[PDB]
Symmetry: C2
Subunit: 71 residues, 2 copies
């Protein structure tokens, strides 16, 4: 039943899912922490003005993603 | 005012944020469709019975990621 393009979308999408699988591992091995605690730290850090100075483009978009899940 | 771990966390996060950008561009060049219409097709496709059968874990995470994105 799956069309060719439906087959290709799923296969393409899955590759981004296996990326999520490496990031979890990379967090565990790079900083020696759970993925959950990593995002708790990222949460707190994003609102610090010092983080904004460091990478202005990145934390502006992290802030926008934050504000769209609540508002 | 940033510690070493905090600067590294932000650099590490920058790489994955750059990945999401490349995914959008890949959506537009490969499938020649806008990102929003891609997720329309993708999300309508999860409800299709043959998609659940062909791959259990992908749609199950995709089903579980929109259910959570909706419940609150």
């Amino acid at each position: 039943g799956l069309t060719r393009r439906e087959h290709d979308i799923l296969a393409f999408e899955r590759q981004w899912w296996k990326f999520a699988g490496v990031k979890e591992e990379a967090i565990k091995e790079l900083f020696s922490m759970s993925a959950t605690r990593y995002y708790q730290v990222l949460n707190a850090l994003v609102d610090r003005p010092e983080a904004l100075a460091a990478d202005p483009m990145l934390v502006k978009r992290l802030r926008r993603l934050r504000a769209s899940r609540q508002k």
